[PDB]
Design an enzyme around this catalytic site. Structure first.
Site, PDB file in Angstrom:
ATOM      1  N   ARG F  53       0.812  -1.224   0.000  1.00 13.34           N
ATOM      2  CA  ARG F  53       0.000   0.000   0.000  1.00 13.34           C
ATOM      3  C   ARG F  53       0.841   1.268   0.000  1.00 13.34           C
ATOM      4  O   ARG F  53       0.676   2.151  -0.847  1.00 13.34           O
ATOM      5  CB  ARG F  53      -0.883   0.058   1.258  1.00 13.34           C
ATOM      6  CG  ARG F  53      -2.247  -0.614   1.179  1.00 13.34           C
ATOM      7  CD  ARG F  53      -2.585  -1.244   2.544  1.00 13.34           C
ATOM      8  NE  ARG F  53      -1.615  -2.308   2.784  1.00 13.34           N
ATOM      9  CZ  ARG F  53      -1.747  -3.541   2.319  1.00 13.34           C
ATOM     10  NH1 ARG F  53      -2.843  -3.878   1.641  1.00 13.34           N
ATOM     11  NH2 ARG F  53      -0.793  -4.436   2.534  1.00 13.34           N
ATOM     12  N   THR F  54       1.716   1.379   0.989  1.00 14.42           N
ATOM     13  CA  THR F  54       2.400   2.643   1.211  1.00 14.42           C
ATOM     14  C   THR F  54       3.254   3.038   0.008  1.00 14.42           C
ATOM     15  O   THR F  54       3.138   4.158  -0.489  1.00 14.42           O
ATOM     16  CB  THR F  54       3.215   2.636   2.521  1.00 14.42           C
ATOM     17  OG1 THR F  54       2.379   2.158   3.578  1.00 14.42           O
ATOM     18  CG2 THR F  54       3.700   4.045   2.869  1.00 14.42           C
ATOM     19  N   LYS F  83      27.652  -3.646  -0.249  1.00 12.77           N
ATOM     20  CA  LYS F  83      29.008  -3.103  -0.201  1.00 12.77           C
ATOM     21  C   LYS F  83      29.378  -2.500   1.150  1.00 12.77           C
ATOM     22  O   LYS F  83      30.480  -1.969   1.318  1.00 12.77           O
ATOM     23  CB  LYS F  83      29.211  -2.075  -1.320  1.00 12.77           C
ATOM     24  CG  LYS F  83      29.107  -2.663  -2.722  1.00 12.77           C
ATOM     25  CD  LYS F  83      29.420  -1.615  -3.788  1.00 12.77           C
ATOM     26  CE  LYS F  83      29.140  -2.147  -5.183  1.00 12.77           C
ATOM     27  NZ  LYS F  83      29.548  -1.174  -6.237  1.00 12.77           N
ATOM     28  N   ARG F 104      10.910   4.295   4.094  1.00 10.89           N
ATOM     29  CA  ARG F 104      10.442   3.342   5.095  1.00 10.89           C
ATOM     30  C   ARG F 104      11.639   2.512   5.527  1.00 10.89           C
ATOM     31  O   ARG F 104      12.423   2.070   4.686  1.00 10.89           O
ATOM     32  CB  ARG F 104       9.347   2.424   4.529  1.00 10.89           C
ATOM     33  CG  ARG F 104       9.065   1.193   5.408  1.00 10.89           C
ATOM     34  CD  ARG F 104       7.865   0.383   4.913  1.00 10.89           C
ATOM     35  NE  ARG F 104       6.609   1.096   5.139  1.00 10.89           N
ATOM     36  CZ  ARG F 104       5.407   0.527   5.174  1.00 10.89           C
ATOM     37  NH1 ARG F 104       5.273  -0.784   4.994  1.00 10.89           N
ATOM     38  NH2 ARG F 104       4.334   1.275   5.397  1.00 10.89           N
ATOM     39  N   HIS F 133       3.997   6.487  11.667  1.00  9.86           N
ATOM     40  CA  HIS F 133       3.498   6.263  10.318  1.00  9.86           C
ATOM     41  C   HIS F 133       2.568   7.442  10.003  1.00  9.86           C
ATOM     42  O   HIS F 133       1.357   7.275   9.928  1.00  9.86           O
ATOM     43  CB  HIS F 133       2.722   4.938  10.270  1.00  9.86           C
ATOM     44  CG  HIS F 133       2.614   4.337   8.899  1.00  9.86           C
ATOM     45  ND1 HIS F 133       2.810   5.065   7.741  1.00  9.86           N
ATOM     46  CD2 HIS F 133       2.293   3.080   8.503  1.00  9.86           C
ATOM     47  CE1 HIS F 133       2.630   4.277   6.695  1.00  9.86           C
ATOM     48  NE2 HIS F 133       2.313   3.069   7.129  1.00  9.86           N
TER      49      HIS F 133
END
Lengths: 307, 307, 307, 307, 307, 307
Positions: F53-54, F83, F104, F133
């Site tokens: 969704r986000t 790396k 996120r 959130h």
């Protein structure tokens, strides 16, 4: 019998007389087996890291003397492996069962630690990380004495991974107990013989030197002791030394003395070409076979008071 | 005693008289145990691939004769498994310890190769990849002789994975040493009996034939020898044959002769339904039990010169 | 000798007289060893899940009585592990080899199931999942009798994972066979003593109670039986109970009675602090040592008819 | 515009007129691009299994028409992959964001299932397991029409894995909508064209036949449609068919007609040797390039009502 | 516009005039953006090994010029990753879709190889194993010119893994195209600048030297170009060089010239302490930001003929 | 426009006026789209943990406003993943490319940390571990206002994992900015609403209470906000709470008020039965759809100064 019920942890804990007693006993057993010396003994074979020679030669030696064997070849199916049990608890419990514990462990000092938890049960160190390997040294000495007729006034080269080689730490200390031995150390800089070993040699006024090839000492040595790079013990900053830096080939033996023997505690990887196996100098399989007599001797002396 | 100190590698290396000697000795031991025949022997149990029957029956047989045992059930905790040691070096070292080596290995020819490195120590092949399984054949013959009263003039069907079945390669060769046996081979095309086996039968003028069902030979056979698909040996282009193509159920035995026995070297997977277990024809567990007498016999003959 | 050739599967199958016979025999063997009682026996050590104490103490006991041992410590290198063989077939074949089978398996009922396939060979249950552990109970009883002088009219607390603790299921049932014992159960709600155990106690009119701390029963108990959370048996909905909810420290023993002993079948994880090891109450290593005499006794009685 | 807002799931759902409309539109766009046709559209590229051609050609086509793209190339970083979300919920949520969903999924029927949860948002099937691949068929038809000038009265061979080839299921159904096509199916028995396809051909009175080599139809075909074995979809009982059973080499084309084209939806593995790439018959890269015009056409028609 | 439709594979393929053209264009775009220069272009971003800077800066640059982007950041969900497709086939198909391909691949020569299969589509090398990184060099040059005002007569030190550093191979070659630059190479012996680079410098009569510390050149350099050890490219015999042998700390800059800039293509690991970030010499984040203007310039020139 | 170039990290940083501005803007955009508001912006979509969704709603929103997007959905193919690059360096470099960063990350405080390295580039927190959130809260508020006509004087129940639910931390804080809201918290004890949230409510004199079932508040609530157990964030001591302790079924809604809506930020696992989907109360898919308008609004306000 000074060895009776003695913990066998470090060559440092043994005297030259102790070593001579084991060797003489081993020679005697080689000539006259005693199939029932240890009848009614039960011995633990407790291997926490891989082994072919050490474990099987130890167990064979136990059976040759009439003893029984219980144990494991890896910790994966023990409660230490699956249930979170500590090594200390493991030893404490096993020591209520058996008459002696033979133990190999990946951590330096593990065998010494075991003696703190084994109560009145003798611990025999089959290798504790990169530290000590006293029973390898007993068979090495037996083999050197057998081929050279003595343990003093020898020229001995040690080659390969001397930093992590528990074999050479013990053997150097043992040979340093006899008169007039001369050491040649040939190793990558990163895997050099530890300073604590060198300091001990200096304290005793023992002659030693460093070299960058096998060739430069080949003409002078009685014993060429080759070693495997201890790959599974290397720090990441040492991985460039995984490949043998000194490889012995049959052609390298062109100027070896007639009495010179190539020893190797085994297993070998790339450091000895198989064409060496055919020369009179190759003595590593004879050496491995002598593990039976050395280990029988040690078991007999530790577990039977009467000589 | 032609078997004394003999390497036991391939049925090809044994004569019919050799086989008869083992069987007669096995029968004698079944009737009159000798708990101390091999007292003071130490034998290596060297298993480089999985086993239940072969290893445990071999070790039990050793103990029943008074011998001791050292070894391993997988190579993972050996120096071969963890330190890069070759098989050749492994055998060389073990052969300095023990009086005989029992060895199972996933590679065809491994047991033969071991004899090149075992010095004066007899090697007994407990299975070398898909090649040979001589001691399975000894117990199979013992079992066939026990139920049929003879090893000649029999009708013998072999079913399943004949290509990779080391069991059937050895058994076919052994039965081909006796007069007048008739073979029926029932296998998927991909897992057919190898040409080299068939050529041998042709050279001896032995009758054999191929069939596409158990049913078409059921009425004629004295021995129905079922096999497991050797899943762990299959080439990827053979994975369609993983499931048993011929499944034996109790109902399939409706027209079996009264003397017919179902053999299976075991383990079984899907090829024999468990309802067969209750019929008089089921003889695979009796067959497995006979591994004790066959293997005791072989050990006694190889390790004790005096009959 | 009611135990001769008896399957030893559940404490439920044994009478109080059976238990007393094993304990008296164990005491006698502790005082007067019989190194040849089981000479010429071969026993299977069949471990399908991890073990330190149970397997090594059982095998040691076998050797102390002169028996030989074959088996495995995990199923990975068996045909069950690699070739798809069923447990039933595995037991059937092993039972044609040996005189008794000692078996530990992760599934409840596995030992009982084995008896259906073992023919005339006695099965001894070394632990079947979370169900039974009869030989742990034999050594526990031996230990309780040794420290308390009796098995009746005791106050016994059991602490930790009683739901999955096969140790406490067997021990509770055994102690319920004697007069006047009083039980205190201290467990997380999720790992409470199973209802079927509690119902049995109620049927016998045995006093028991539940408690939420060690402290509230410390002053009253003769035996404090600690247990490990059976992490490898927990349902996901029980993972919050992985950490010991009741931790015993030396300071918790301040009001313990002088005769009180802390038992623990071992291995321990976090539930007993090591400072307890130094108090007179710590008896888990003595308890483990008693496994030798209890298991020798059981083996001797099961395998030798004449008392 | 019959395609406006139509779900594109199975060739079965499309008429011959539908197909002709897409092809004519694709030809028109090939000649006259419309960089802004789909300006202000946002389309989901939802790939739940691997793709090179289908996903990148679809996304390129979107951009060529001015649309934007959101989505994923594997489910591993979606909430379906990491948080346990169902496919149904996934589609429901995505359908509140975008103007169309392009979806590829390993399970047969997944695209059809998606239409049940996509509300008023058109779903375009980029492949649903071994079932359908309608947009591959659109580009295949475009390519066949481009090289043959027609879609009727052709001789078309399909080779390889016809059982699991979603490509050939869709293409066979599409070509069956035109007059007088003749099919030759060449596949391993295990990977034969499904019965449901064959039944459809029979219902329409369409001529088809089976063959065991490419050679026996080479002289007669207009289109040789090669396929890859769908290794990742095979049942274990089919693993023997992983290697291409029919391999096309340049030399096999010696008697091909001058108009014959070798098609392959790609990727290819072993079934077409690279020496074919140089012949005039090789047309699989041209075919892949036509995916742009076919997919632009489909997107334009589905998302823009006005022709 | 000599760069129009040019493959950008190796700095070796570019002239000094080519480089100057890109830099001048980059400066112009930095001052005056052209949001629609590449409107209606679609470019492939084809990354077969990890990237943060190169891929995101390239894609940002594409969007800043109005182009669209399709591609992948790893090969795992491509048909090359899952279905066995060759790289050659992958490029061939992608080249039918897009107007240019930006490609990074772990194998030396992969970008050059791609040009053989890309038809008329320009390939831009975003890094091919340890070989070339031409676009890193373009931004490096832009950055050097921006801070030094020129690209000739500079003193430039390169530090770290010069053997595997594709960054320094390209940058050294580029700077060797201008007059009078002087190079200082500081690397572990095992990761020294390749001989082929050094030979090129010798052919041009360019001054260079080797050094064993940063300190010995610190006072003389205009540019200190630090590099990361290419851990994922190291041969096992080089693993001892995984840790940075030369670590730059703020205190090491005490005698740096006022104009000196520390560059680093990034990512950095241990070779630059974060306290350097605060000094006026730290210019690696500015350098990374210049990737936007350099890459916009290159894209504009390659894809738009008219200057 | 107070939001212009504002970092959007925690609801704590926003005022009620800020929230009202976003909601009013979202409503306006829902009614009148602005396809070119953010033309010539490039935004980073930087997802270091899973999202459906986000991420997709954010990217769709970017495209709906005419912005372009670069980024990644997992860190595995970034230089941070392969790396050893730090997050700080990653953000620093990305911030030289783009006009805003949507991020996120699995670690609490990661978004705040990013703002320290992003220079003048706004960071928008798409979720930082179990902390905040904010954009979920914006769409939640939009949805609550849409269905209830207001954001004050509501009765709001939050159910499930309130400890790890970043969704409820942000939403509770936001609703606490309006007058007279009443909270009901229904959670397992182990996953209770954090004390810091409760303390904030107490400081504001906001009414709240705890309950042990959905049923006891069902008749009173305007909003039932269900949550998923944050399985991937749970401490091992919390694994017993993996299964939803409160499951909502359609039958549980029998006494719900006519205006009551069931919200769920999604994804859902077991906590909402699918039969709820058909009731008028189910509003989670509408809620997810509102993410487009809320996120468009936020992007427009942050990136375009002029209202």
């Amino acid at each position: 019998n000074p060895l009776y019920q003695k913990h066998i942890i470090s060559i440092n804990d043994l005297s030259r007389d102790d070593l001579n007693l084991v060797l003489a006993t081993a020679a005697k057993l080689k000539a006259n087996p005693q199939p029932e010396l240890l009848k009614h003994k039960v011995i633990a074979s407790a291997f926490f890291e891989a082994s072919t020679r050490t474990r099987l030669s130890f167990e064979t030696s136990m059976h040759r003397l009439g003893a029984s064997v219980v144990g494991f070849s890896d910790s994966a199916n023990t409660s230490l492996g699956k249930k979170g049990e500590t090594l200390a608890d493991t030893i404490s419990v096993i020591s209520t069962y058996v008459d002696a514990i033979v133990m190999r462990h990946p951590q330096e000092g593990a065998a010494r630690l075991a003696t703190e938890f084994s109560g009145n049960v003798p611990v025999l160190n089959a290798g504790d990380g990169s530290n000590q390997h006293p029973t390898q040294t007993l068979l090495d000495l037996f083999t050197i004495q057998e081929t050279q007729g003595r343990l003093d006034n020898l020229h001995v080269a040690m080659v390969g991974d001397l930093k992590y080689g528990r074999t050479v730490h013990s053997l150097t200390q043992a040979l340093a107990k006899f008169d007039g031995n001369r050491f040649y150390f040939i190793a990558p800089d990163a895997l050099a013989m530890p300073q604590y070993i060198l300091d001990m040699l200096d304290e005793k006024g023992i002659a030693w030197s460093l070299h960058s090839s096998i060739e430069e000492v080949m003409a002078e040595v009685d014993i060429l002791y080759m070693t495997r790079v201890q790959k599974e013990r290397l720090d990441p900053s040492e991985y460039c030394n995984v490949k043998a830096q000194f490889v012995l080939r049959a052609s390298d033996l062109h100027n070896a003395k007639a009495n010179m023997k190539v020893l190797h505690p085994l297993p070998r990887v790339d450091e000895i070409a198989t064409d060496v196996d055919k020369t009179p100098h190759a003595w590593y399989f004879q050496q491995a076979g002598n593990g039976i007599f050395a280990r029988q001797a040690l078991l007999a002396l530790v577990l039977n008071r009467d000589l």
